[PDB]
Design a protein around this ligand. Structure first.
Ligand SMILES: [Cl-]
Ligand SMILES: [Cl-]
Lengths: 124, 124
């Protein structure tokens, strides 16, 4: 059992690097964050900002989530992020990922109190 | 009954402008594309490129869809796009939208043959 807040940190936070390293960043990160354990997670985004900057997004712009809920927030500024998506030539347990580095606003759903990010909804 | 291809064109294509006009672009577009008819669509992206450039994305990078399917493609280049998302101060039939203009790769699911975009999966 992992708290929803802890799961968000593990799947989406990468404060140790300013941006994706090389084309192998995703294969390495998806593996060490245990996102390739029983299955290959198809899509996952990593945010390269402090945990505190990502958490502050829960007090930023209140916007709707793609699912219609209203506890999503879009960051006022763009953040360094890296999208990891399985390549068509990927097959569990030999997971393969395309790394796409970019700067975009992130939108996250927040919940609990402490009111922290619990789901990565999208980047803009 | 609208074909899936026709629905994608109507919800996501805006080849008539190079980029979102002003902060009211989304209120105007979501209304005239009939996305505010019986309900307020919570999130919707418009692509400002030709229909032909968007359709060519179906022969570009084959990547997985957030849902795990494998018929998604990410465009090799960034495209002018505009994200429209309901503000927390939006309530049907007085739909309210935040307009966020940006340049990102788009990822779309393609299907049918003619093999054309049928769903906007995400932008990167
Ligand atoms: Cl994600
Ligand atoms: Cl959309």
């Amino acid at each position: 059992k992992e708290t929803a807040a802890a799961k968000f940190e593990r799947q989406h936070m990468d404060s140790s690097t300013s941006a994706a390293s090389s084309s192998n960043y995703c294969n390495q990160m998806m593996k060490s964050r245990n996102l390739t354990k029983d299955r290959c997670k198809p899509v996952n985004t990593f945010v390269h900002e402090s945990l505190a900057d990502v958490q502050a997004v829960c007090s930023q712009k209140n916007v709707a989530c793609k699912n219609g809920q209203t506890n999503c927030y879009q960051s006022y500024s763009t953040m360094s992020i890296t999208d990891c998506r399985e390549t068509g030539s990927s097959k569990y347990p030999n997971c393969a990922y395309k790394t796409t580095q970019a700067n975009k606003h992130i939108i996250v759903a927040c919940e609990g109190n402490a009111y922290v990010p619990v789901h990565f909804d999208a980047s803009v």
